[PDB]
Design a protein around this ligand. Structure first.
Ligand SMILES: *C/C=C(C)/C=C/C=C(C)/C=C/C1=C(C)CCCC1(C)C
Lengths: 994, 247
């Protein structure tokens, strides 16, 4: 394995570009030659129009598969770009097929597009109208197909490929020359050679089969690689038969049958090819075994590291603190079997109950052939596309099972994979197809609407019901498989989605806008609460990293979905409010395209999700510059992993680690995580592990971020500032002002004035920004205080351990310094001490005597001083004692500054600011509404958010010491200090023993 | 189109965001300057320490140890701000190899160098090798570490809230400008919005750069030259002393 990412993309590009250039140039040269040279009579370009619709249908149904693949492979490659070996795996699974398949789809779609353009009716027997580009794109398609087949099945790069390829192209061009001329005139010259070359390539195929007649290791006892070859060749035989029979017999009508057979055949052929390919590809190979083998070794090495550190710590703590001081399968199928029937029955109930309640008690009940010419051409597309997708999925599953039939152990895996998800897809597909079929040729009534203003607005019935049902599927799926949740929490969303769809319908029926707005607003409300529930579900995901491997694809998915959904509503508005805006056919076309695209995207994402490790269990599964705030705190791998384990996924991050870890250990861990996630538990305990846990569990909550990134600042929600009840007041005021200005008409007489507006604006702006620049400073001063405190503590400890000769005073001093730090972290939050934070540093009785006091740092300093006096009296200290005393003095100054930083700004200055801000905001609309409407409203909302958020942000920053996430991380500094001093004791002890 | 431009949505947002964006930059220039000051103070303290030692001490094996490990202290702090380890090529003629391998085996380096220095000075004081001027030496050592700690403060980033607010409302203003400008212009609206966007966004990114002064970027501080300067000076000082002692 030595591949890369650039080479594969380069090869895919070059291959597909060669495909496109050849395909285009062939048609171009043929067009140029057929006009002036030879006997080539060109029929009229215009006639007929009825045949182009078929080719359009084919065009769409083909484009679909392109999109599918172009999205799936992208998902895969972008979901694991962070791990070398998964990249190796996937890039191996798609050596060279991608570019060629993409070129095939591009050329076929381009040709079936050109058919609409009506470039040239070169058709020249009688009738039997033919089109030329078909021949060129057939050359290209068959050539790419044969290259793929030979490469995959036999591995002959340049030997067989050349001969068979030239044969293919040669006899295709011969058939072109032949059919272009009259049958009697030039059949013998070319068509015989064509048949002969066909036989030649068939013999080559048979010989290469005899050469390497081995089955695909991906499959087992399957007849694959033989069934498909037989099918392809008998299919080419049928194609040649049709070619011979078209011109010969007049009985077969060339007007419509002819034009349809080739489309059908090309499509089905390419589809069978690509589906067999995808099936062969989705199977697990040996590379996955290689990767799992690499993975387990990492957990093993980790346990080894843990044991080594354990032994080291034991020896060290001893030295220093001792001397000187077939059932499952059938059910996995039957559950889905049951779900499908529920969905079908619900749809039937709707379709049955609709019209008896409409047009029997409803006006504008009847539209006689609503619009025969335009609509059906739009609707005949959808059910065809959905049929395509249906067939794809069905045969893929059939092939998977056929390959895992003989082996029981393998069957249960796939069986469990398809559970909870397959039943919804078939139901969705079939119901959409049936509804759009009904719409194509109408068996169901069409209702029009009559209201003041305009009344030509047309309206369709069934489209809505399916939507509701449709949506529920997605919900029950997109909130279960992605975010693992039970049913008890899905209820509300289902109960509300059908609700707001029914409300949208009822509203749409009556555009009188006397009671139209009611159901519209209720629908918006239910939809919004659904969105809120959904985003809550997301933000409380237990396994956010699984399965897409620590990336931002899931939130982006949710965003796309919600944007689509609200686009629906704004189109609804733009249409029913201003029917002059919408030509009313574009409207149905858009509705249809959107309904298609949504399901296409949903199914492709679920497809890519199905084939990840979390489903297929192997080694696990379903049961520059230095930005930081702690530049002295360095941690070890064992603790990092122990932590990531003892916590819930998604609390630690990449930068959290880049700040609290060295560079080399980080690179090592990164290399070690190339294979997977590396979740494990050694279950080893010590006296220091407890302390480290107690500190880190608290310290992590605070936020660390990389300023260079712009996304994670805008799209961020967590660290933002809260707002107040004022925004709601202001929205209330503005809404009443708007509705009332309209109801009251023109007689508002705003009489805006520049003094009341601009002056207030500049004043309040000055004030609000100054009140914030004043709080940033306090934040910074607190940072400085903390740093100074830490530094003084360390200098004190060094001074003591060097300029003092006894050993019982030294401990006392150092340990009580540590206690002093931990005490001040608990004097700012008005609490008492948790013994777990002073385990290996102090005896119990000392702790109970501490917590019995009122001011702790006072006590610790008193202790230290009395101890140092004892020392000085007994001549145990060199003449350097004044330095020690001065250090003690300098600690307390830092403490006192930190304590200043708890006062709040004075009352007066805050009252003034806030009240006049409130005034300005409450006055804005009365002066803005003169020239705008709803825009006044949205602008006031945004501006209010800006200002009020500024004020609350200042409030937050004012006191830097607290639990909030923008505050200072006191709990990490204490840990740092503990580490350093307890290592210092040992340094001294060692240097003393020699 | 019916633009219906409005003065409140435009002028107010403009003045606010402008205030904010210039203040967020005047706040970073200050950190840049403070870092400069820290570095200068560190250098000066090192030199005074070395002179004090070479004058107020009479032995010769302690002197080397002290001076050379002071140099090592500087080179260490230049590598504590960038989270790396030391390249021996930077300590060739000043230290023995084993000392370097023992250094890189630690977690916090300046800690270690200071501990060394202090134990050495205590050894000296015990044997009556030092005049009564020792408290000055201790105080100099104390004053080095303050400079270091300031330099280390300067690695924190501004708080989240204050940055999120600014950035999002800037984005809004920009995305809203055309709908109100296009009424009276065409392509000119486009070019103007391009230029204005460049101004604002460049201001923000410039602030980002200046925020942390220690790094590889070209607008950052040149730590690698100060170390060289210090090495030169101290290694010349040793020779001055040696010569003046031989006569
Ligand atoms: C497969 C198609 C689906 C799931 C489409 C669902 C459509 C909606 C959720 C749209 C709902 C609307 C509202 C937001 C309120 C106004 C009326 C609608 C239908 C546009």
């Amino acid at each position: 394995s030595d591949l890369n990412f650039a080479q594969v993309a380069r090869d895919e590009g070059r291959r597909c570009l060669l495909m496109c250039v050849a395909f285009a140039i062939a048609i171009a040269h043929l067009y140029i030659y057929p006009a002036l040279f030879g006997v080539r009579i060109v029929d009229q370009a215009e006639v007929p129009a009825e045949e182009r619709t078929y080719f359009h249908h084919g065009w769409t149904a083909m484009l679909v598969i392109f999109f599918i693949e172009g999205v799936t492979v992208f998902l895969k490659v972008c979901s694991t770009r962070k791990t070398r070996w998964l990249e190796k795996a996937v890039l191996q699974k798609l050596d060279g097929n991608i570019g060629v398949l993409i070129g095939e789809y591009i050329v076929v779609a381009a040709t079936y597009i050109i058919m609409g353009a009506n470039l040239i009716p070169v058709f020249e027997r009688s009738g039997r109208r033919v089109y030329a580009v078909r021949y060129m794109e057939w050359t290209i398609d068959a050539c790419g197909l044969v290259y793929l087949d030979c490469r995959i099945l036999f591995g002959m790069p340049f030997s067989k490929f050349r001969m068979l390829l030239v044969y293919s192209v040669l006899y295709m061009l011969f058939g072109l020359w032949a059919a272009l001329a009259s049958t009697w005139m030039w059949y013998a010259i070319f068509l015989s050679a064509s048949w002969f070359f066909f036989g030649l390539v068939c013999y080559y195929y048979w010989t290469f089969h005899r050469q390497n007649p081995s089955p695909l290791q991906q499959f087992g006892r399957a007849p694959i690689k033989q069934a498909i070859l037989v099918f392809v060749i008998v299919w080419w035989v049928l194609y040649g038969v049709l070619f011979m029979l078209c011109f010969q017999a007049p009985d077969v009508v060339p007007q419509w049958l002819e034009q349809l057979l080739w489309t059908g055949m090309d499509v089905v052929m390419k589809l069978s090819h690509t589906v067999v390919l995808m099936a062969w590809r989705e199977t697990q190979w040996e590379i996955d075994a290689v990767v799992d083998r690499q993975k387990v070794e990492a957990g093993r090495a980790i346990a080894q590291l843990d044991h080594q550190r354990a032994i080291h710590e034991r020896d060290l703590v001893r030295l220093r603190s001792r001397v000187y001081y077939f059932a499952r399968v059938n059910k996995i199928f039957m559950r889905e079997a049951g779900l499908c029937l529920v969905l079908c029955l619900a749809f039937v109930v709707a379709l049955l109950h609709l019209p008896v309640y409409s047009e029997w008690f409803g006006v504008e009940v009847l539209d006689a052939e609503a619009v025969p010419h335009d609509e059906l051409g739009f609707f005949h597309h959808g059910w065809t596309t959905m049929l395509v997708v249906f067939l794809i999925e069905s045969i893929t599953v059939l092939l998977k099972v056929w390959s895992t039939w003989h082996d029981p152990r393998l069957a249960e895996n796939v069986a469990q994979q398809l559970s909870g998800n397959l039943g919804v897809l078939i139901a969705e597909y079939l119901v959409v197809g049936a509804t759009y079929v009904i719409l194509g040729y109408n068996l169901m009534p069409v209702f029009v609407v009559h209201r003041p203003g305009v009344a030509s607005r047309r309206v369709y019935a069934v489209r809505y019901m399916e939507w509701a049902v449709d949506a529920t599927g997605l919900i029950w799926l997109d909130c279960h498989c992605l975010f693992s949740r039970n049913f008890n929490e899905f209820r509300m969303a289902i109960v509300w989605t059908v609700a707001y769809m029914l409300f949208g319908l009822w509203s749409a029926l009556a555009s009188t806008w006397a009671w139209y707005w009611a159901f519209l607003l209720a629908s918006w409300a239910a939809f919004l609460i659904v969105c809120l529930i959904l985003v809550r579900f997301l933000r409380q995901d237990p396994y956010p990293h699984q399965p897409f491997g620590k990336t931002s694809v899931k939130p982006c998915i949710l965003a796309f979905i919600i944007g689509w959904w609200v686009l629906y509503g704004i189109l609804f508005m733009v249409c029913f409010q201003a029917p002059d805006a919408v030509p009313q056919w574009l409207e149905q076309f858009l509705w249809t395209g959107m309904d298609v695209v949504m399901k296409l995207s949903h199914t492709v994402v679920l497809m890519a999700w199905r084939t990840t490790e979390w489903n297929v269990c192997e080694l696990h599964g379903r049961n520059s510059t230095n930005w930081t705030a702690t530049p002295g705190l360095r941690v070890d791998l064992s603790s990092m992993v122990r932590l990531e384990g003892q916590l819930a996924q998604g609390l630690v991050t990449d930068v959290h680690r880049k700040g609290m870890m060295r560079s080399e250990d980080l690179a090592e861990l990164k290399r070690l995580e190339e294979s997977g996630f590396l979740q494990a538990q050694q279950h080893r305990n010590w006296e220091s592990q407890t302390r480290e846990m107690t500190f880190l569990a608290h310290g992590i909550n605070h936020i660390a971020y990389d300023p260079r990134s712009w996304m994670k600042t805008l799209t961020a929600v967590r660290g933002r500032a809260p707002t107040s009840f004022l925004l709601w007041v202001v929205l209330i005021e503005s809404s009443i002002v708007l509705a009332l200005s309209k109801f009251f008409g023109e007689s508002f007489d705003l009489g805006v004035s520049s003094g009341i507006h601009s002056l207030f604006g500049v004043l309040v702006s000055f004030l609000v920004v100054f009140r914030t620049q004043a709080a940033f400073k306090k934040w910074w001063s607190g940072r400085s205080a903390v740093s100074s405190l830490v530094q003084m503590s360390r200098t004190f400890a060094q001074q003591v351990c060097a300029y003092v000769k006894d050993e019982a005073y030294v401990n006392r001093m150092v340990r009580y310094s540590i206690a002093t730090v931990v005490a001040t972290r608990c004097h700012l939050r008005n609490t008492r001490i948790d013994p777990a934070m002073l385990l290996g540093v102090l005896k119990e009785e000392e702790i109970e005597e501490l917590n019995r006091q009122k001011n702790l740092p006072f006590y610790t300093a008193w202790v230290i001083r009395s101890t140092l006096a004892e020392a000085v009296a007994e001549g145990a200290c060199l003449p350097l004692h004044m330095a020690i005393e001065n250090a003690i003095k300098a600690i307390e100054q830092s403490i006192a500054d930190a304590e200043r930083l708890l006062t709040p700004m004075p009352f007066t200055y805050v009252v003034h600011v806030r009240t006049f801000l409130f005034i300005y905001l409450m006055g804005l609309p009365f002066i803005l509404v003169e020239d705008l409407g709803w825009l006044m409203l949205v602008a006031v909302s945004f501006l209010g958010y800006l200002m009020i958020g500024l004020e609350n942000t200042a409030v937050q920053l004012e006191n830097p010491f607290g639990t909030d996430c923008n505050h200072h991380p006191l709990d990490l500094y204490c840990l740092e200090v503990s580490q350093d001093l307890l290592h210092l004791l040992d340094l001294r002890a060692s240097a003393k023993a020699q």
